[PDB]
Amino acid sequence: KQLLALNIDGALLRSNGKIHQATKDAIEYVKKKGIYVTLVTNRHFRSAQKIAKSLKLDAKLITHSGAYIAEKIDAPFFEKRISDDHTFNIVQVLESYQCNIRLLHEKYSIGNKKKVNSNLLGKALIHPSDPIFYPVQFVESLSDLLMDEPVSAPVIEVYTEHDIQHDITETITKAFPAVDVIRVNDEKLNIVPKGVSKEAGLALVASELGLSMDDVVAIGHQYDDLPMIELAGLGVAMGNAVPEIKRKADWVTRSNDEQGVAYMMKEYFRMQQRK
Amino acid sequence: KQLLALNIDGALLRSNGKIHQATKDAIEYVKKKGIYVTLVTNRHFRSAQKIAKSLKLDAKLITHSGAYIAEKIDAPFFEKRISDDHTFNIVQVLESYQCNIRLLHEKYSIGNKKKVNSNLLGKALIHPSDPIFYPVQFVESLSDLLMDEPVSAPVIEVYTEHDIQHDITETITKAFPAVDVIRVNDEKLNIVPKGVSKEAGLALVASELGLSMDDVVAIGHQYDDLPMIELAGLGVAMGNAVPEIKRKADWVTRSNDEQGVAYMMKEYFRMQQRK
């Protein structure tokens, strides 16, 4: 294998947001062996890049659910975003539902203030804004703000109770042919430009490197990771993934709180040594 | 003539920052006659675009001294910026001089806190930051900040007393072949990527429209406007420009506090009617 692609949340990071020393040591070793290491994430580019900096990756990172692929923010390798007018229209529709909305731009994030009965929203790791490089604000009315401040969003994140996800998904897919809806988990959807995804972004990076998906190890933990797990040469589910995802993977490793990334890569190399 | 290009500061705007009703009326008339109206400015893109919105321009605007040409911020027609490493190195050199430095990014601006004996700095119109869309911050040490927060700047603005401009200009030009130094006035320099300028940006826009510089009316007021004044089919100096600029123009109009833009365009049309 020639390319290792890792989720950040639920894989690289422990549930307290720390990167374990064993994980750092495993990634350093992987790189020393000539394997290209990148991140494949729903996180905004800036958060992903600071993590990459900690791991000394110097790689094209696949961020904003595949909509933004870059090594340095001002000069992306691949970018796609929802038009400002479509973003406004989508926000108006979502405002009629009980859902928390976040426009996840690479330069800032803006969300509404609607409270939802969602525990995964409560569990999700919060990471810093920066008042210059990444302001994060909430407003009571997103669509009112967008009237005078249009936003062209690479990703719109939608948190809800599970009961209405199918309806929101149907309503958006039908009304907006320019976007796709990606189910992340029971309480979170990403709305992205049509054709954008983690697996599509990963394919673009592998192709750029002269590799195929056959040459890729992909490590994921949620529903939106399933396609890259199925399509990669070796698709790995973290121990903290739900049972369905674990059944669908080629390989199940330990959890993100038990250094499952390091554990899996140690075995990958033992396998190499045996062969 | 087919294309009207206007400065914002010192031309479109009165010295109190207001756009006079006569100016609005003149621009509406120009557009109704089929003439393409755009802005050519040292201002950051966002400030230029809000002004364009007020004038209902819907045009490609030439901003950041020609480094950023766009109708909508996320999707530029033309962009060039100084690399992050060159930006850092340039800032380090400038820090050894008595000068106020501002990194004029399209998403934010960051400057140092050095005080200079400069009245044109005192006179220059301040326009709003926005905590989401355009944060503006000052730090004691720009180069220290850039160590952990690299910036790839379309323009670096440098304010000084007049006595050291030549030395700074020489030092930068010699040390950084990837950039050009543009003298704006006796107390302000812009450092831009090589080949970037107001006149170059204007040429790119005219070419995109199937026009030549011959078809352009350009209205400017400072040293950095001289090339487009000389190169445009009709180059106009505002009344508030210094005498040298007024001598070099084809036509001198009234000042920005006496509606010189409106006054000049009224004559342009009287000329048309006579012909």
Ligand SMILES: [Mg+2]
């Ligand atoms: Mg861009």
